[PDB]
Design a protein around this ligand. Structure first.
Ligand code: GAL
Ligand code: CA
Ligand code: CA
Ligand code: CA
Lengths: 214, 211, 211
């Protein structure tokens, strides 16, 4: 990792103005492909999660969430270890984008986002809510470890990941569940899906979601 | 690094997609290469498909380029100037209507002058094309955006027609105009090619390409 | 990238998509890596899925590769020969019918000889596969295109069946064959796998991949 840029803002500043896949050079000297959104809200956003069509299975294990998974062309999770390494230094603001089946867009912004390391179960450290038409459904999850079906760290007598078919910084269980089970419409919706409580509520999911940092 | 798409094709890159070019300033430039059409080696510098990207942008935005490699984009006037400094690049314009019929226009050469000359279009002869000629009018004219009026109208054509182009008063083509998903949704001024479907009768997909 | 998709995955490349491999000669080769299927690390060298790309192509086109990163392609015979000069590459064939049913075929090893040997297929033993074995017949045979007949037939298999393959007289598999959008539009010879749906009963989606 022969130098490279440290984030999407730096790529943009350097003249990379089209959104798409770029390599960042991580602090440890490892190259990482990432999707940079160079257009929304001034550009320079590192998109680390995307839901679009239900083509990719998000009901995955600790190791899968740790390393990342999915398809560049469609849906993915960048990986918790990548996110921890990226967010160690610098202030990264979080933007969440949501789109319902009508094509109505809503959003949520948070001042900072950081994940602790694997020993701390990639615990979420979330900054304060700034603004968002979708409302705040992630603050509850701040301070909580990540749990998957094979790594129960939540505050429930059960395994929330198993219970609600996802992976997240579950409590018992959630106000948000963006790595939840995909549904192509309300009819096909699951009890627990790609939900944002303060927007459309539990059991009433979104068609497209993105989570992004700048 | 490679300086264009034909160079890339010659070295064995035979699949159409995104590649990196090396600009004179030692800058890496992502570009879309069409490695198939008419033998291949075409740098696609503008694409419209779905209305997902806003094309009503400022001088600075058009100078730098904007958009999404996954969908619609404008490569950027400065990028285009630097690319076309040398060589004679042929221009191919591809249009697709709402029924899916494709038509085209071919111009012998395409070059943009520098920013001091307002990215003036230098265009060779229309050679052939089922879409007919709707760019010759614009040859020799500076680029105009809503915040930088260089056209031949007392008003600002970019504002009147909601786009950016080498406007006169105002246009025979307007490929950076406002997107419309169907006819029914058509704007008075849209993604238009006057010799093709005419002003006010837009296309669903457009590509502008150099080779 | 390193030598194959497994090595990329092992270095942290966990998202499926287009990566670069560095070939023996020192040429960078864009390839698609599937980082998920059966643990991931598969290099996909052929993909069919729409019919948007013409697969009835010449010897030199099959040598160099052709298609679109976003959709259908053939990686190229010379590329495959270079990749398989070293290492052990298992072949996985993925087939999908018009109902979404997915079947597979696995072979222990896969290698292509050089051009002087007409990119002859060197195929290992069929291990398992719900689609059954329809490539074993083709092992040890030269590749054939409409402009280069090397098959075991008095005719040109590539012309008769409209594709390109390691034809005998003619085939039990024809995955580079003419696309069909339905079972109703099916051709005498199409994208066929004898032991699967059989000759004349084509698939909607196909991938050929190595690990
Ligand atoms: O029993 C699980 C439940 O946990 C709640 O806190 C959450 O609001 C619901 O979405 C549901 O997941
Ligand atoms: Ca628990
Ligand atoms: Ca004016
Ligand atoms: Ca013969």
């Amino acid at each position: 990792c022969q130098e490279g840029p440290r984030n999407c803002r730096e790529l943009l500043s350097q003249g990379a103005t089209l959104s798409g896949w770029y390599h960042l050079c991580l602090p440890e000297g490892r190259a990482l492909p990432v999707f940079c959104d160079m257009d929304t809200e001034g550009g320079g956003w590192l998109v680390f999660q995307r839901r679009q069509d239900g083509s990719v299975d998000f009901f995955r294990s600790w190791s899968s969430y740790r390393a990342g998974f999915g398809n560049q062309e469609s849906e993915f999770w960048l990986g918790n270890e990548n996110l921890h390494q990226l967010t160690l230094q610098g202030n990264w603001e979080l933007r969440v984008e949501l789109e319902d089946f009508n094509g109505n867009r809503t959003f949520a912004h948070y001042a900072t986002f950081r994940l602790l390391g694997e020993v701390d179960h990639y615990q979420l450290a979330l900054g304060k809510f700034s603004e968002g038409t979708a409302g705040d459904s992630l603050s509850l999850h701040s301070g909580r470890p990540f749990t998957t079906y094979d790594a129960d760290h939540d505050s429930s007598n059960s395994n929330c990941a198993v219970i609600v078919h996802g992976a997240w910084w579950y409590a018992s269980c959630y106000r948000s569940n963006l790595n939840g089970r995909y549904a192509v419409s309300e009819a096909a919706a699951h009890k627990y899906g790609i939900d944002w409580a303060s927007g459309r509520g539990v059991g009433h999911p979104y068609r497209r979601v993105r989570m992004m940092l700048r």
